Design an enzyme around this catalytic site. Structure first.
Site, PDB file in Angstrom:
ATOM      1  N   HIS A 186      -3.289  -2.784   8.630  1.00 44.39           N
ATOM      2  CA  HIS A 186      -4.321  -3.279   6.905  1.00 44.39           C
ATOM      3  C   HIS A 186      -4.892  -2.256   6.734  1.00 44.39           C
ATOM      4  CE1 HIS A 186      -3.978  -7.266   8.000  1.00 44.39           C
ATOM      5  NE2 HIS A 186      -4.751  -6.830   9.756  1.00 44.39           N
ATOM      6  N   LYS A 232      -3.391 -10.252  -7.887  1.00 50.48           N
ATOM      7  CA  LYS A 232      -4.759  -9.782  -7.183  1.00 50.48           C
ATOM      8  C   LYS A 232      -5.288  -9.737  -7.662  1.00 50.48           C
ATOM      9  CE  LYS A 232      -4.925  -7.073  -2.205  1.00 50.48           C
ATOM     10  NZ  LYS A 232      -4.269  -5.847  -1.191  1.00 50.48           N
ATOM     11  N   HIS A 273       1.079  -0.904  -0.079  1.00 47.31           N
ATOM     12  CA  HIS A 273       0.140   0.033   0.654  1.00 47.31           C
ATOM     13  C   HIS A 273       0.397   1.058   0.186  1.00 47.31           C
ATOM     14  CE1 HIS A 273      -3.598  -2.556   0.144  1.00 47.31           C
ATOM     15  NE2 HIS A 273      -3.230  -3.331   1.765  1.00 47.31           N
TER      16      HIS A 273
END
Length: 135
Positions: A130, A39, A16
């Site tokens: 996350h 993904k 990310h």
């Protein structure tokens, strides 16, 4: 879904933060080569790891993706981000997966935890683990 050489925070950074190319097809090769599958979608925040760590210092809130977790934190500001969407799967040859890219400017909500004692650097006691939601 994380390869064993990564802590959760390192995998968060890999998925990310560290967008290794501005092109999604190239950037996603890293994630996909590590996790051994293409993904379907993924968001890169155009921000620094240190900025996200500081967002972990914002008030705790419920994680939108999990009504039972209270370790989430909302960014103070919107950031530019790139969302990658798989267009061409290639499960037998991951390097040939192709992606579309969608730029946006959005707030983010991250889940944060205490760092991995053995493997995360002591510099950051609290780390993002996350990307829960972009808004």
């Amino acid at each position: 879904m994380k390869p064993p050489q990564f802590t959760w925070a390192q995998w968060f950074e890999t998925q990310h933060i560290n967008m290794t190319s501005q092109q999604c097809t190239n950037a996603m090769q890293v994630i996909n080569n590590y996790q051994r599958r293409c993904k379907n979608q993924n968001t890169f925040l155009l921000t620094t790891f240190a900025n996200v760590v500081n967002v972990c210092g914002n008030p705790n809130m419920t994680c939108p993706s999990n009504k039972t977790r209270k370790n989430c934190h909302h960014s103070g500001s919107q950031v530019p981000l790139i969302h990658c969407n798989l267009t061409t799967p290639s499960p037998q040859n991951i390097s040939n997966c192709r992606y579309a890219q969608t730029p946006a400017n959005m707030f983010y909500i991250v889940a944060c935890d205490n760092r991995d004692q053995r493997r995360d650097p002591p510099q950051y006691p609290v780390v993002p683990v996350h990307l829960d939601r972009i808004i």
